[PDB]
Design a binder for this molecule. Structure first.
Ligand SMILES: C[C@H](C[C@@H](C[C@H](C[C@@H](C[C@@H](CCN1CCCC1=O)N1CCCC1=O)N1CCCC1=O)N1CCCC1=O)N1CCCC1=O)N1CCCC1=O
Ligand SMILES: COc1cc(CCNC(=O)c2[nH]c(-c3ccccc3C(F)(F)F)nc(=O)c2O)ccn1
Ligand SMILES: [Mn+2]
Ligand SMILES: [Mn+2]
Length: 180
């Protein structure tokens, strides 16, 4: 092992996000020491969800990402069985209480159009909202409803570009970009 990417991941993201990403990949049969770009991407996706949920009031979002698969489904079932929304086929990331809809947050190294289409084809569920960010400052949301005020989303974009810069400064961006 001994990747430059792994050491960069541990010093760039906070320990809790690193710990959560280690559990997730290990739960799905992968190891942060080999699939190190997936390690960087899992942390990134985790941090974005956290900043996103931090963008609302206080009780607006229920965080689904960053839970055990069984407990995340339990919370999803309780949300469906109390508000009345349909149960998604694939685990979402958040649930907007203000807007009464699940949210699937994506972070891609391609143009937001293609990644959105793949997840919109994977979901095929309508209902759940889709919101994609990219490492180049662009975003894409369902029905152009970007959910959060603009300010919050702007932060996420800045954070994503800083991650890209630190990766490129360490000459690890090109392998990270051409790996998704
Ligand atoms: C710094 C702050 C942390 C917070 C994220 C989040 C932390 C944990 C809760 C801890 N754990 C562990 C398992 C059971 C449990 O509850 N997780 C992860 C799953 C959802 C969740 O709440 N927290 C804690 C305080 C409120 C909150 O949102 N934030 C918000 C900004 C970015 C960030 O990291
Ligand atoms: C197939 O690979 C997997 C699958 C899982 C199951 C749980 N996963 C999610 O629920 C999930 N997964 C991804 C994603 C997919 C492939 C590569 C990178 C990511 C990314 F961005 F995290 F970095 N994007 C999301 O938005 C998202 O909600 C875990 C670990 N690996
Ligand atoms: Mn998810
Ligand atoms: Mn997601």
């Amino acid at each position: 092992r001994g990747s430059h990417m792994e050491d960069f991941v541990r010093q760039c993201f906070n320990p809790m996000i690193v710990e959560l990403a280690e559990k997730a990949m290990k739960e799905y049969g992968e190891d942060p020491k080999i699939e190190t770009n997936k390690f960087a991407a899992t942390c990134t996706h985790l941090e974005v969800c956290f900043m996103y949920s931090d963008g609302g009031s206080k009780h607006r979002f229920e965080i689904i990402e960053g839970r055990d698969r069984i407990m995340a489904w339990t919370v999803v079932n309780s949300i469906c069985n109390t508000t009345g929304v349909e149960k998604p086929k694939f685990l979402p990331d958040l649930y907007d209480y203000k807007e009464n809809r699940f949210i699937e947050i994506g972070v891609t190294r391609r143009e937001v159009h293609i990644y959105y289409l793949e997840k919109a084809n994977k979901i095929k569920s309508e209902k759940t909202h889709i919101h994609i960010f990219s490492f180049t400052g662009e975003e894409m949301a369902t029905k152009a409803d970007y959910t959060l005020d603009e300010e919050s989303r702007a932060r996420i974009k800045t954070r994503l570009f800083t991650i890209r810069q630190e990766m490129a400064s360490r000459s690890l961006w090109d392998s990270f970009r051409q790996s998704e």
